[PDB]
Amino acid sequence: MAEIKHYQFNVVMTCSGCSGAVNKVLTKLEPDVSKIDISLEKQLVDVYTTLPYDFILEKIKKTGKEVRSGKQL
Ligand SMILES: [Cu+]
């Protein structure tokens, strides 16, 4: 089992690429993740999933940008 928790991350999404790259990573997590939202303006990324915090932090930064911080909700 897992329940869907709401994670929020701040990733340094300044180039018109990394947004797409994270999104592409999301495309693999889709059949597990419940919901996603992504914001360049406010340099933040909200993901509603089962998968643990650390996994997502890695997954995000993996794409190239740094992950500044995040939290769970
Ligand atoms: Cu970027």
Curated annotation (Swiss-Prot):
GO cellular component: cytosol
Statement: the UniProt record of this protein carries the keyword Ion transport: yes
Transmembrane helix listed as a keyword: no
Binding site for Cu(+): 15, 18
GO molecular function: copper chaperone activity; metal ion binding
Cellular compartments annotated: Cytoplasm
GO biological-process terms attached to the record: cellular response to oxidative stress; copper ion transport; intracellular iron ion homeostasis
Induction entry: Expression is induced by oxygen. Expression is also induced by the iron-sensing trans-activator AFT1.
Regulation: Tetrathiomolybdate directly and reversibly down-regulates copper delivery to secreted metalloenzymes.
Residue intervals of the HMA domain: 4-68
Location (main, coarse): cytoplasm
CDD domains noted in UniProt: HMA
Keywords: Chaperone, Copper, Copper transport, Cytoplasm, Ion transport, Metal-binding, Transport
Family (UniProt): Belongs to the ATX1 family.
Function: Copper homeostasis factor that specifically transports copper to the secretory pathway for incorporation into copper enzymes destined for the cell surface or extracellular milieu. Shuttles copper to the transport ATPase CCC2 on a post-Golgi vesicle for eventual targeting to the cell-surface high-affinity iron uptake protein FET3. Protects against oxygen toxicity.
PANTHER family reported for this sequence: COPPER TRANSPORT PROTEIN ATOX1
Assembly: Homodimer. Interacts with CCC2 via the copper anion.
Name of the protein in question: Copper chaperone ATX1
Organism this protein belongs to: Saccharomyces cerevisiae (strain ATCC 204508 / S288c) (Baker's yeast)
Organism taxonomic ancestry: Eukaryota, Fungi, Dikarya, Ascomycota, Saccharomycotina
